[PDB]
Design a protein around this nucleic acid. Structure first.
Ligand code: UA6
Ligand code: DG3
Ligand code: MG
Length: 644
DNA sequence: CGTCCAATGACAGC
DNA sequence: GCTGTCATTG
C-alpha cells in the first residue's frame, strides 16, 4: 500500500486499460505536471506555458483511490510509438468532458490556474463538476490563512506528511505539480499531489456535510470559481492611448498646481517632503499646528492645503494607477487589442471577490480638474480612468448593478418598516440624506457630497461612533450623537436586528449568511472594549455584506449558465486562443464590483445579454424585498449610459 | 488605549 | 525584514 506511479502512456494495452477504468469513475483527482528546463540533457518535451519561459507541461497525474497515481505523459514521443500524442490528447479530452446525463466530479488543487493551463497550453477545456480543496478550506473558516498543500495534509491527512518531507514547495500556496521550481520531477510532484488531494477532499467533503455547507460548495462557490476562470481568460480591454492621454492632462494640472502653490508660499517647495510642507503651512504661516488628509481638510479654510490635497490625489492616480495598468497590459492578437489580465481572489472574510495584479476594482472614480480655457480659466474637465477600459472592436461594455443590495438585505432581516418604506419611494437615499444635512434641493447634490452621505449612511448603520461621524460631518461630537440617536429612533427594527445579531453571535460564536456560511468571531466575548466592539460590528456587517456576496455569486453562476445555452461560440477569449477568423458573439464576464457585474458583449447580443443579466440578477434569491437592477451599456467602463 | 465593514498595494522607522 | 499606516475602491 505504498506510493505507486503507473505510467499509462508506456503501453497501448496498459493505456486502454487505464482509459477503460477512468471512463467509469465518477470521482477522480488530477494534478498538472509542470517542469522547468533545468538541463538540456534532461529537458522534456511538452506544451509550453504562457507567461513562463523554459517551463513546460510535461504530463498529468490522475488518482481515484488509495496511493495509486496514474501518470499521463504529454511528451511528443512515448515508449509505445503506436500511441501518438494526438491519440493521447484525444482520450485525455474524451475523459475530461462529460455528457448531459452522466455525472462526474474532478478534484483539482488551484482549479482556476489548472483550468487555464489545460486550455491555453494543452488545448483541453474541462467539462466536469469541479471541487477545489482551497475553496473547501475557506468555507470552514473564511478568516483562515490561505491554504497550502502542506497545511491541508497537516490538518486533513496527517499520516501522509512524510510524503511531503523533502518537497518544501508543498508549503507554498501554489500547487505542487504547478511549481516547476522544485528540483523534484513534475511526474513525482503531480503523482504525489493527486493522491494527497483526492483523499484529503473526501475528508473535506465529510466535514462540509456535517456543517451543511456542501450544497453551497457545489452549487455556488465552485461554479463561481469556474466563472472567475472564464473572467481571467477573458481579461479586460485596455486603451494605452486613452490612459496616456489622461496621464498628460493630469501632469499638466500638477504643473499648474505646483506653480500656483509656489506663488502662495512665495518660494518653491517639494510636495513629496512633508518637512517642506510643514515648514510652509505652519512655520511660515498662521495655521494651527497639530500633513495629513484629515489635518489638511481641517486647514482647508489659505488655499494651499486644497492645492496640496489635489496634487496628492492626481499623483496617486499617475503613480499607483496609470503606472501599474501600463505595466500589466499585454497584446491579444486574436482580438487585435491590448487587454489587462487580473487574478481573482475569493479567499475573503465575507465572501466578496477582489482581484490582484492589478486590482482593477480600485481604479479611481471620475473626478474633475479645472484647467485654464479661453474664458473660464477654471473650466471643469472630467478625468475618467475607467474610460481607458474598452470592449473589443465591435462590442460594448454592459454594467448591471443591484440598487442598494445591502439595504434590501438589511430590510429583509430587520423587517424595519421605515427602511422598506424608504426603498419603495424610488428616490436616492444618499441625496435625501445630503438634502437634509446641507438643507439643499436633492437635485443639487453632487457626487462628492453624495459619496460623503454614502459613508455617513453605511457608517452609522455599521456602528460608527459620534466622534468619527462628527469628523465626517465637520460638527461637534455631541451634535453628531443626535444624528445617531435620531437614526436609532426612526429605524428601530434595524437596531433590534443589531441587538439580536450581537446576542446570538456571543452565544453561537459565529454569524451566518443567508446561504449558511459561517464566519467565526471569537472576539465577541473579548474583555478589551475595542476588540469586543470591533467583533460586534463585524457580526452585523458580515451577515449583510456576506449575503450580498452570496447573491452576486449565484447571479453570476446563473447568468453564465444562460449565456452558454444560447451561444454555441467560444466560452471565453481563452477558448479562442487555446483552440485557435470567426466573429465574436455573446457576452464575456470581465469584472465583478461587489454589487455590479461588468460584461463585454457583442453588439448583436447586447439586448439579449441585457435581458439575461437583469432577469437572472433579480431572481437569484427570493427576499421579502424586491431586488432591483439597473443595466447600463457604453463604449467604455466610463461612458456607460442607461439601457432599458 | 486603538471604536463603520470589506479589499489591494506602496512604502517606512521600528 | 518588516507590521503599520494610508492612498484608493466597493
Ligand atoms: O436618518 C438619518 C439618515 C438616514 C436615512 C436613511 C437610512 C437608511 F434607509 F438606509 F436606513 C440611513 C440613514 C443614516 F445615515 F442615519 F444611517 N439621519 C438622522 C437625522 C437627522 C436630523 C437631525 C436634525 C435635523 N434634521 N434631521 C441623518 C444622520 C446623519 C446625517 C444626516 C442625516
Ligand atoms: N461599511 C461600508 N460599506 C460600504 C461603503 N461603501 C460601500 N459599501 C458597501 C455597501 C454597498 C456596496 C456597494 O457600494 P456602492 O458604492 O455601489 O453603494 P451604492 O449604494 O450602490 O451606491 P450607488 O447606488 O451610487 O452605486 O458596498 C462604506 O463606506 N462603508
Ligand atoms: Mg451600487
Amino acid at each position: 500500500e505504498s506510493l505507486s506511479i503507473i505510467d499509462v502512456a508506456s503501453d497501448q494495452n496498459l493505456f486502454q486499460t487505464f482509459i477503460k477504468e477512468w471512463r467509469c469513475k465518477k470521482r477522480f483527482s488530477i494534478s498538472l505536471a509542470c517542469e522547468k528546463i533545468r538541463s538540456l540533457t534532461s529537458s522534456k518535451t511538452g506544451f509550453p506555458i504562457k507567461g513562463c519561459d523554459d517551463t513546460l507541461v510535461v504530463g498529468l497525474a490522475v488518482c481515484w483511490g488509495g496511493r495509486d497515481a496514474y501518470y499521463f505523459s504529454l511528451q511528443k514521443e512515448s515508449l509505445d510509438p503506436s500511441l501518438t500524442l494526438k491519440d493521447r490528447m484525444w482520450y485525455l479530452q474524451s475523459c475530461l468532458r462529460k455528457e448531459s446525463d452522466k455525472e462526474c466530479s474532478v478534484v483539482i488543487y488551484d482549479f482556476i490556474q489548472s483550468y487555464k493551463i489545460l486550455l491555453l497550453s494543452c488545448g483541453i477545456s474541462l467539462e466536469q463538476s469541479y471541487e477545489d480543496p482551497k475553496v473547501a478550506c475557506w468555507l470552514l473558516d473564511p478568516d483562515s490563512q490561505e491554504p497550502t498543500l502542506h497545511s491541508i495534509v497537516t490538518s486533513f491527512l496527517p499520516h501522509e506528511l512524510p510524503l511531503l518531507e523533502g518537497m518544501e514547495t508543498s508549503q507554498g500556496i501554489q500547487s505542487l505539480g504547478l511549481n516547476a521550481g522544485s528540483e523534484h520531477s513534475g511526474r513525482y510532484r503531480a503523482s504525489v499531489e493527486s493522491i494527497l488531494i483526492f483523499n484529503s477532499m473526501n475528508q473535506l467533503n465529510s466535514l462540509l456535510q456535517k456543517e451543511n455547507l456542501q450544497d453551497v460548495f457545489r452549487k455556488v462557490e465552485m461554479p463561481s470559481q469556474y466563472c472567475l476562470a472564464l473572467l481571467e481568460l477573458n481579461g479586460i480591454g485596455f486603451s494605452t492611448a486613452e490612459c496616456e492621454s489622461q496621464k498628460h492632462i493630469m501632469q499638466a494640472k500638477l504643473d499648474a498646481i505646483e506653480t500656483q502653490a509656489y506663488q502662495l508660499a512665495g518660494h518653491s517647495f517639494s510636495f513629496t517632503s512633508s518637512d517642506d510642507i510643514a515648514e510652509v503651512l505652519f512655520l511660515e504661516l498662521k495655521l494651527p499646528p497639530n500633513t495629513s488628509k484629515d489635518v489638511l481638510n481641517k486647514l482647508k479654510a489659505h488655499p494651499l492645503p486644497g492645492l496640496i490635497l489635489e496634487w496628492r490625489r492626481i499623483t496617486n492616480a499617475i503613480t499607483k494607477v496609470v503606472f501599474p495598468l501600463q505595466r500589466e497590459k499585454c497584446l491579444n492578437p486574436f482580438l487585435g487589442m491590448e487587454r489587462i489580465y487580473p487574478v481573482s481572489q475569493s479567499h475573503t472574510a465575507t465572501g466578496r471577490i477582489t482581484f490582484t495584479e492589478p486590482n482593477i476594482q480600485n481604479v479611481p472614480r471620475d473626478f474633475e480638474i479645472k484647467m485654464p480655457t479661453l474664458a473660464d480659466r477654471g473650466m471643469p474637465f472630467s478625468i475618467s480612468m475607467r474610460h481607458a477600459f474598452v470592449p473589443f472592436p465591435g462590442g460594448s461594455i454592459l454594467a448591471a448593478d443591484y440598487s442598494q443590495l445591502e439595504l434590501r438585505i438589511l430590510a429583509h432581516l430587520s423587517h424595519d418598516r421605515r427602511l422598506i418604506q424608504v426603498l419603495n419611494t424610488g428616490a436616492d437615499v444618499f441625496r435625501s440624506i445630503a438634502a437634509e444635512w446641507k438643507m439643499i434641493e436633492p437635485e443639487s447634490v453632487g457626487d462628492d457630497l453624495r459619496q460623503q452621505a454614502k459613508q455617513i449612511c453605511y457608517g452609522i448603520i455599521y456602528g460608527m461612533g459620534a466622534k468619527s461621524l462628527g469628523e465626517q460631518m465637520g460638527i461637534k461630537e455631541n451634535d453628531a450623537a443626535c444624528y445617531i440617536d435620531s437614526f436609532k429612533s426612526r429605524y428601530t427594527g434595524i437596531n433590534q436586528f443589531m441587538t439580536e445579531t450581537v446576542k446570538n453571535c456571543k452565544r453561537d460564536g459565529f454569524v451566518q449568511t443567508i446561504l449558511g456560511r459561517r464566519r467565526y468571531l471569537p472576539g465577541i466575548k473579548d474583555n478589551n472594549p475595542y476588540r469586543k466592539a470591533h467583533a460586534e460590528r463585524q457580526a452585523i456587517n458580515t451577515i449583510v455584506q456576506g449575503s450580498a456576496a452570496d447573491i452576486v455569486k449565484i447571479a453570476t453562476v446563473n447568468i453564465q449558465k444562460q449565456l452558454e445555452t444560447f451561444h454555441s461560440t467560444f466560452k471565453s477569449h481563452g477558448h479562442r486562443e487555446g483552440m485557435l477568423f470567426c466573429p465574436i458573439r455573446g457576452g464575456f464576464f470581465i469584472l465583478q464590483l461587489h454589487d455590479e457585474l461588468l460584461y463585454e458583449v457583442a453588439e448583436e447580443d447586447v439586448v439579449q445579454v441585457a435581458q439575461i443579466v437583469k432577469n437572472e440578477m433579480e431572481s437569484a434569491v427570493k427576499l421579502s424585498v424586491k431586488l432591483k437592477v439597473k443595466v447600463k451599456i457604453g463604449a467604455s467602463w466610463g461612458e456607460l449610459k442607461d439601457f432599458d
